[PDB]
Design a protein around this ligand. Structure first.
Ligand code: NAG
Lengths: 313, 369
């Protein structure tokens, strides 16, 4: 009945590495550690993790504190973490920001609006011939925006991408062979922003697009962001490691242990199994979310921890 | 999203599927098979006397999930290990007195039952056995000898004996102890016992801690006429056992026209008892007991004797006994399928192990377990 996350022993390094990376990018402020239910310390970067050296020191302190305990973990033992986090404060390394910068610069030559025909709308000159619209060359992203060449920042505070500087065009959007003149194309200031981590990524579905409006004019977007994940912005997460072993039951596999041989092997808490069953049905029929049933890697799944083994007969 | 697991659990099981189709199916099968290995059990010793004790061990003064009592008991009912007629009338008595029904050999008190009497009443050398600690002897010196009676007294125990010189008045003696505090009474004949065992778990069902007595007629004695003052009566068995003449003897002596529950076979009347609504409500029977019918040997109905009061006090929904040694009859097959609710059954208890595996499997399918 306690929310959190449970790690099998064999995966402890994987999980610890995650906490370390969290500390290094200013996402985690403090971690409170305890062995078999007893507090044995607390890891916290000095001065709100302002310096890279202090953040790296906390990451090391964590591994040093727990590695021998975890590697020597036996039946019944367990290590509990209490992770206080805030995704807004996340920062990015020099290599991370320079890796995004290159992928942004590939959109420099992308076409926003094509040229118009007599039958489809596109770029048309701002001046007409015989009082009727003629076509113009397509609109590049380089015409409306100037993407930066380099990055800005330091190792202590993090690195950043400046928002591409906005530009104007005097060309228009309309149909070739229409009396009515083409309508203006302008940038959307509310759709061009700088990038420096902060729990976000580049939204390539909405970035560098031309969007027609109700009155017929066109607005263009620049660098648009989106949440890296749908988890809450801040809070404190509990993580446990035990000596249990992990078993994978894929019913779509060629071979897999049947439900009969599973009850043969283990005893399960009856309330826990029916709560899962009921959660599946409420999703199937009514579309009700449930923490018990999740969709991960294109497979819906439930998680059981059995009471123990079933005694032979 | 997830949860903080119990540190003593040995495994982290993740079940995966493309369509929550197949996931629902796997969890549904698990929900049932999990309940099966926990709640489908055999209770048998290697002797009729020894099987009756194993029932006592599991359900009286026990830590079991479905124990009648988890503390010591004050009363005990004792019946001769061969006298089936006696402990059939005695099953209601054991239910009302909150007592296990145990079996003994006529000559001498057996070693095994003697130790179980101590365990179930919590008898110790450092505590005084006071007057509340009693043993009922259902039957005369014919079934349970005078020697055994004195062996019990010499332990420092109280032994009331309900009996007579014949089967008809011993049953009267037992029925007189049982509370005839409401208008029901079951009637059976001296012959046709397998008709009668089917009603033992029903008579053992309690209303305000009152059991329903049964009387054994000849198919009336003047003693039985006074005993059955203006009672609604249900006759269990065929006419072969209770004539329509003695059905009228009851109609006249009481003033009540009695009802009859009967079948062609002993397994048919078993099925008829289940399908009676006053006995078990339709679509609400989740707990079942299985015991030998005596087709191969009439002497094996003894095992149903000790299980009848436990089944009639089981959980909060009573249980019938399905009589079947080698096979189940079609009548029993359909009656069970109608008794069970949509969801399925919750408990199956095999009493004794002279019952064929075929029969237990048929039960499991009928009940979705
Ligand atoms: C297994 C687990 O939950 N790990 C957490 C994750 O939930 C959180 O989002 C992240 C900070 O970004 O810190 C990780 O340690």
């Amino acid at each position: 009945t306690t929310p959190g996350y449970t790690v099998v022993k064999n995966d402890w390094k994987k999980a610890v590495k995650q906490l370390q990376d969290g500390l290094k990018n200013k996402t985690i402020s403090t971690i409170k550690v305890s062995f078999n239910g007893n507090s044995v310390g607390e890891v916290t970067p000095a001065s709100s993790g302002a310096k890279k050296a202090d953040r790296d020191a906390a990451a090391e302190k964590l591994y040093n504190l727990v590695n021998t305990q975890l590697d020597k973990l036996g039946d019944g033992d367990y290590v509990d973490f209490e992770v206080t986090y805030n995704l807004a404060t996340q920062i990015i390394t020099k290599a991370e920001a320079e890796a995004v910068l290159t992928k942004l610069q590939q959109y420099n030559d992308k076409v926003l609006i094509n040229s118009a025909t007599d039958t489809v709308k596109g770029m048309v000159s701002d001046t007409q011939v015989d009082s009727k619209n003629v076509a113009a060359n397509p609109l590049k992203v380089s015409d409306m925006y100037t993407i930066p060449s380099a990055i800005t920042g330091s190792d202590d505070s993090g690195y950043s991408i400046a928002k591409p500087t906005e530009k104007t065009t005097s060309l228009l959007y309309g149909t070739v062979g229409d009396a009515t003149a083409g309508k203006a194309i302008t940038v959307d200031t509310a759709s061009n922003e700088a990038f420096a981590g902060n729990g976000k990524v580049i939204d390539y579905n909405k970035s560098f697009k031309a969007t027609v409006q109700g009155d017929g004019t066109v607005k263009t977007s620049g660098v648009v962001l989106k949440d890296a994940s749908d988890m809450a912005a801040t809070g404190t997460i509990k993580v446990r490691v035990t000596s249990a072993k992990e078993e994978s039951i894929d019913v779509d596999s060629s071979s897999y242990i049947s439900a009969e041989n599973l009850a043969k092997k283990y005893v399960f808490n009856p309330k826990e199994v029916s709560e899962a069953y009921n959660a599946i049905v409420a999703l199937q029929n009514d579309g009700i979310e449930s923490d018990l049933v999740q969709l991960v890697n294109g497979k819906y799944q439930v998680i059981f921890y059995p009471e123990g083994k079933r005694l032979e007969t | 999203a997830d949860i903080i697991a119990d540190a003593d659990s040995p495994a982290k099981i993740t079940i995966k599927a493309n369509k929550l189709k197949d996931l629902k199916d796997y969890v549904d099968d698990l929900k049932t098979y999990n309940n099966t290995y926990s709640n489908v059990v055999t209770v048998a010793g290697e002797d009729r006397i020894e099987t009756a004790i194993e029932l006592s061990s599991k359900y009286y003064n026990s830590d079991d999930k479905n124990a009648i009592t988890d503390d010591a008991v004050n009363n005990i009912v004792l019946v001769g290990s061969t006298s089936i007629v006696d402990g059939l009338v005695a099953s209601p008595l054991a239910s009302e007195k909150t007592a296990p029904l145990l079996l003994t050999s006529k000559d001498k008190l057996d070693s095994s039952v003697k130790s179980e009497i101590k365990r179930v009443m919590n008898l110790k050398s450092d505590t005084g056995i006071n007057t509340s600690k009693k043993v009922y002897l259902a039957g005369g010196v014919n079934s349970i000898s005078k020697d055994v009676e004195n062996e019990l007294k010499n332990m420092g125990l109280k032994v009331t004996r309900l009996s007579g010189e014949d089967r008809y008045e011993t049953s009267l003696a037992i029925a007189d102890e049982i509370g005839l505090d409401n208008d029901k009474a079951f009637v059976v004949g001296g012959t046709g016992l397998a008709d009668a065992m089917s009603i033992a778990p029903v008579a053992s069902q309690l209303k305000d801690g009152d059991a329903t007595p049964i009387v054994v007629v000849d198919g009336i004695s003047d003693d039985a006429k006074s005993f059955l003052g203006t009672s609604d009566v249900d006759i269990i068995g065929g006419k072969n056992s209770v004539s329509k003449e003695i059905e009228e003897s009851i109609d006249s002596a009481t003033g009540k026209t009695p009802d009859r529950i009967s079948g062609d076979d002993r397994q048919a009347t078993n099925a008829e008892v289940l399908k009676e609504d006053d006995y078990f409500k339709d679509g609400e029977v989740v707990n079942y007991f299985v015991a030998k019918d005596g087709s191969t040997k009439e002497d094996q109905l003894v095992d149903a004797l000790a299980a009848a009061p436990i089944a009639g006090r089981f959980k909060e929904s009573p249980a019938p006994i399905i009589l079947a040694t080698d096979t189940l009859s079609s009548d029993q097959n359909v009656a069970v399928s109608k008794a069970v609710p949509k969801d399925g059954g919750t408990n199956l208890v095999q009493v004794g192990k002279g019952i064929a595996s075929s029969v237990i499997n048929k039960m499991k399918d009928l009940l979705d377990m």
